[PDB]
Design brief:
2 copies of one chain form a homodimer. Helix content of chain A is 0%, strand content 46%. Chain A is mostly beta strands and 158 residues long. Chain A has 2 domains: 91 residues, Lipocalin; 67 residues, RNA polymerase II/Efflux pump adaptor protein, barrel-sandwich hybrid domain (OB fold (Dihydrolipoamide Acetyltransferase, E2P), Beta Barrel). The two termini of chain A are 32 Å apart. Chains A and B meet through β3, β8 and β11 of A and β3, β8, β11 and β14 of B. β8 of chain A pairs antiparallel with β8 of chain B. It is classed as unknown function. Keywords: protein structure initiative, PSI-2, unknown function.
Chain lengths: 158, 151
């Protein structure tokens, strides 16, 4: 990854089910009733679902249409709060596409319908806005894989 | 009108017949139990929903507390000693938001204040953080206080 668009930003940590990598992990136990954040390098011997930390990734990989195929967990920067979204959770995608795009470089926060997620600037310097289509929570944000510096927001309607 | 579904609050030391949550690995393991636990954690017992201030000394928690927001699929664990910030919503008339248990960026509107002449002012989130609780201010009817976690 070359465009490190979250660098020097305090953002939440997001963990996706079965995305095997060397990131931090969280074990979802007891059919959703226990959450265990695993120590870096701790050997997990249990039988729950392991969710792995992703940062620069395409959330559409974990979605069939607009429903999540994999469990997702968000660990907020406060270091006290978490949100756990089971597979089957319906998410709204809000793309921010234009000549030049200025997105909010964050995710995991509440918004009202109409909140401005991005500003789109034309080759002539004129502006358009990408506003939240609903009130809810922005769950994640990523660069559109084939469109350098164009982004998409993933939202959970309230 | 109605707000969000009512949160579940669990507090340490309140040995009762309610639902329990065990806190292990010093914050990093949270186990909701139903109906026999002998682990090495600390049990938090469900309490009847009430102001969070009944478990704080000024701005700081006095006991380990966990809040589960079922509408929101979200929980927060507040170890004893955790400091919260208060955002009062006070005015001739106050129109607060009717939900909490979510992260907000700075500037998110928590209340509209209205003067006796009908002019408006807004109480916004002063910091980015988590809105974990809100209640009516005890001696001030129809006035409210939001409690946040600064991140």
């Amino acid at each position: 990854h070359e465009n490190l668009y979250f660098q020097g930003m305090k953002i939440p940590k997001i963990y996706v089910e079965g995305e095997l990598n060397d990131g931090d992990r969280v074990a979802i136990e007891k059919d959703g009733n226990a959450i265990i954040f695993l120590e870096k390098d701790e050997e997990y011997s249990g039988n729950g679902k392991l969710l792995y930390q992703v940062i620069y990734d395409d959330l559409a990989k974990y979605m069939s249409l607009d429903t999540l195929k994999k469990d997702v967990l968000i660990q907020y920067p406060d270091k006290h709060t978490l949100t756990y979204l089971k597979a089957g959770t319906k998410l709204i995608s809000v793309p921010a596409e234009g000549y030049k795009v200025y997105p909010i470089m964050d995710f995991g926060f509440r918004v009202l319908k109409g909140y401005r997620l991005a500003t789109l600037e034309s080759k002539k310097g004129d502006l358009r806005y990408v506003n939240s289509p609903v009130s809810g929570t922005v769950i994640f944000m990523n660069e559109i894989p084939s469109e350098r510096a164009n982004y998409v927001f993933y939202m959970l309607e309230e």
